[PDB]
Write a protein that binds this ligand. Structure first.
Ligand code: NA
Length: 266
């Protein structure tokens, strides 16, 4: 049959859905390993591939992006997904591919960008791209990273590390931070990211764990909020996600806490 993340109810998405807000008319770019649009449960409105060796963004050889995309839909079932392939089959990609995909999303007027990806080094050009996307009014969300801890050192990866980005950690169904969730002052909010069931290539479903799974729930969140408040800016979307969270533990580990979309949408 099929499945849906427990995370959809954890972040209070069902309340919005029930009120008729499901992400309709919101464009979300899933910057990742592509999206298998063949999946019966996923509809992909457009996209682009920047992986020179994989020209079809609608084909996902890794499964990473399909799963992620499935999560955004789970949270915002009416959203318009854009498959922006910047990661090849082995799950890896050049920072340049990623920038290119970010640029594409700005140029193509995406409302929200989900980046369930990261690397340990910063790039000014990557910073510039995310910063420009935010200045352009796009809500930019990224996985915080799955680097665990290292003392007092920040383990948030890039781009999640840039203040213009909403870096999302992962919690489990009990709201406990996942051992792998990156930490540091740049962590902004948390979302479910352990054993999240989602779509996989080949009319399949499956579970994955990672801040990459947390991220799409917040990207979906933004989408639901935008569908209720089509004129709010990214600033407003972001602040409301951030200010209505359910406080959990300390900021270093949990950011402002878990997202509560119902509250966020006012
Ligand atoms: Na950040």
């Amino acid at each position: 049959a099929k499945c849906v993340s427990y995370g959809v109810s954890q972040i209070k998405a069902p309340a919005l859905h029930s009120q008729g807000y499901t992400g309709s008319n919101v464009k979300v770019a899933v910057i990742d390993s592509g999206i298998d649009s063949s999946h019966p449960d996923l509809n992909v409105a457009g996209g682009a591939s920047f992986v020179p060796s994989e020209t079809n963004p609608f084909q996902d050889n890794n499964s990473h992006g399909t799963h992620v995309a499935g999560t955004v839909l789970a949270v915002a079932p009416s959203a318009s997904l854009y498959a922006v392939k910047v990661l090849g089959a082995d799950g890896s990609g050049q920072y340049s591919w990623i920038i290119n995909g970010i640029e594409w999303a700005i140029a193509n007027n995406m409302d929200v960008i989900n980046m369930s990806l990261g690397g340990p080094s910063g790039s000014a050009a990557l910073k510039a791209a995310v910063d420009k996307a935010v200045a352009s009014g796009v809500v930019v969300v990224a996985a915080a990273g799955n680097e665990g801890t290292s003392g007092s050192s920040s383990t948030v990866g890039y781009p999640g590390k840039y203040p213009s980005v909403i870096a999302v950690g992962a919690v489990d169904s009990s709201n406990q931070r996942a051992s792998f969730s990156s930490v540091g002052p740049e962590l902004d909010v948390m979302a479910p990211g352990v054993s999240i069931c989602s779509t996989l290539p080949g009319n399949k479903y499956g579970a994955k764990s990672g801040t990459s799974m947390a991220s799409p729930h917040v990207a979906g969140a933004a989408a639901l909020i935008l569908s209720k408040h089509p004129n709010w800016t990214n600033t407003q979307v972001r602040s409301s996600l951030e200010n209505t969270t359910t406080k959990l533990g300390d900021s270093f580990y949990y950011g402002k806490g878990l997202i509560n979309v119902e509250a966020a949408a006012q």
